[PDB]
Design a protein around this ligand. Structure first.
Ligand SMILES: Nc1ncnc2c1ncn2[C@@H]1O[C@H](COP(=O)(O)OP(=O)(O)OC[C@H]2O[C@H](O)[C@H](O)[C@@H]2O)[C@@H](O)[C@H]1O
Ligand SMILES: [Cl-]
Ligand SMILES: [Cl-]
Ligand SMILES: [Cl-]
Ligand SMILES: [Mg+2]
Ligand SMILES: [Mg+2]
Length: 359
């Protein structure tokens, strides 16, 4: 069985979010060395008890995606799944006290018209490249992990994303988040993941054209995400997807902050759809089976650390379960029971290969 990997995916995504958020305290700080100092003072990662560390918007929206997928059930109509996603995204705004939700997410969640034909579609917008689509998409790969479902994974990740983030930098982050989760479910070596994404982007672009909404804008803005990813994979020596990655000789906390800023759009690494999954991926590649290593690279840094953490913790949980994770990092986590229940339901659906009714 692999059910514990689904449970770890949902629970450790949320634990990562909570750890990388610290009730909004890391953001006053916005400095990796200062965060790691505070971490040490609190007793290091294994000492942290998340009982009073609330999850943020990332987990609220990830749960919204997951609950919509579960409610849609077996062999769903995509019209019904998209109604349910839009409804869950709009309704989850009620749970945002203290959670610092993002601009595009909030604005567009309020505009959706779940129940109306194409009611969850919004226009293209140049400013919709934040990481809010990426942070909430991983469980699409839990639901649709089979090779036979790859077109569905593409479509659902993109459309879930562009309910709030109608810009390729935004929604291709959702594709990466979902796709790498499916890769992890299938035990695909992480060194192969980037190349897999690059090879699939033409099929994502095909879907955008065939779907037919804002084709010109979407295709004219595509190069940012694709170039960022190509360049990142070349830097790590993994564009070929058949070689282990190589890291800089000097790559401690301060160097990682400078690198994350180098990837970023507006100065804060991980705040966009391209770089949130990229930083999570960089952390996965370096960390292997070490939760602590993962945390030190993806949860504790001066950028958008709750959001890189939410993605990284999900992928890592799928691969490694709870091995080496201090129980205090999740035992009293907000929504733990709910996350577990949803994980089990996703496992029931995902582990059983099925076929959707496409649009
Ligand atoms: N075209 C673009 N290309 C790249 N980055 C962009 C673009 N447009 C905006 N950005 C970046 O998008 C950032 C603004 O993203 P926001 O719309 O506020 O949020 P969200 O809806 O995505 O929600 C996710 C976040 O909100 C919660 O705090 C979660 O924890 C996440 O951190 C800008 O600062 C830009 O760098
Ligand atoms: Cl630590
Ligand atoms: Cl709960
Ligand atoms: Cl609970
Ligand atoms: Mg957040
Ligand atoms: Mg964030």
């Amino acid at each position: 069985g692999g059910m514990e990997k689904y449970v770890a995916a949902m629970v450790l995504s949320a634990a990562g979010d909570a750890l990388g958020y610290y009730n909004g305290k890391w953001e006053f700080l916005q400095d990796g060395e200062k965060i790691h100092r505070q971490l040490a003072q609190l007793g290091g990662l294994d000492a942290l008890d998340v009982g009073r560390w609330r999850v943020s918007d990332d987990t609220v929206m990830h749960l919204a995606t997951a609950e919509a997928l579960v409610e849609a059930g077996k062999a769903p109509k995509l019209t019904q799944l998209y109604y349910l996603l839009a409804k869950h995204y709009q309704d989850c705004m009620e749970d945002m006290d203290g959670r610092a939700p993002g601009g595009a997410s909030v604005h567009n969640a309020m505009q959706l018209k779940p129940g109306k034909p194409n009611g969850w579609r919004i226009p293209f917008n140049s400013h919709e490249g934040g990481c809010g689509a990426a942070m909430r998409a991983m469980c699409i790969g839990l639901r649709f992990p089979h090779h036979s479902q790859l077109d569905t994974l593409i479509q659902v990740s993109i459309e879930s994303g562009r309910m709030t983030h109608h810009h390729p930098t935004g929604y291709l982050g959702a594709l990466a988040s979902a796709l790498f989760t499916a890769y992890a479910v299938n035990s695909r070596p992480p060194l192969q993941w980037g190349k897999g994404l690059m090879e699939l982007l033409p099929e994502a672009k095909k879907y955008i054209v065939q779907s037919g909404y804002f084709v010109e804008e979407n295709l004219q803005h595509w190069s940012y995400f694709q170039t960022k990813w190509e360049n990142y994979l070349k830097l790590r020596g993994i564009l070929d997807g058949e070689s282990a990655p190589t890291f800089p000789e000097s790559f401690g906390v301060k160097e990682r902050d400078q690198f994350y800023t180098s990837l970023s759009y507006s100065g804060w690494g991980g705040s966009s759809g391209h770089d949130a999954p990229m930083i999570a991926y960089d952390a996965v590649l370096a960390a292997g089976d070490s939760w602590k290593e993962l945390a030190h690279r993806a949860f504790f840094h001066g950028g958008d650390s709750d959001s890189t953490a939410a993605i990284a913790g999900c992928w890592w949980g799928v691969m490694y379960g709870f091995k080496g994770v201090s129980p205090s990092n999740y035992e009293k986590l907000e929504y733990r029971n709910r996350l577990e229940e949803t994980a089990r339901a996703l496992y029931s659906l995902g582990s059983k290969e099925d076929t959707v009714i496409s649009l």
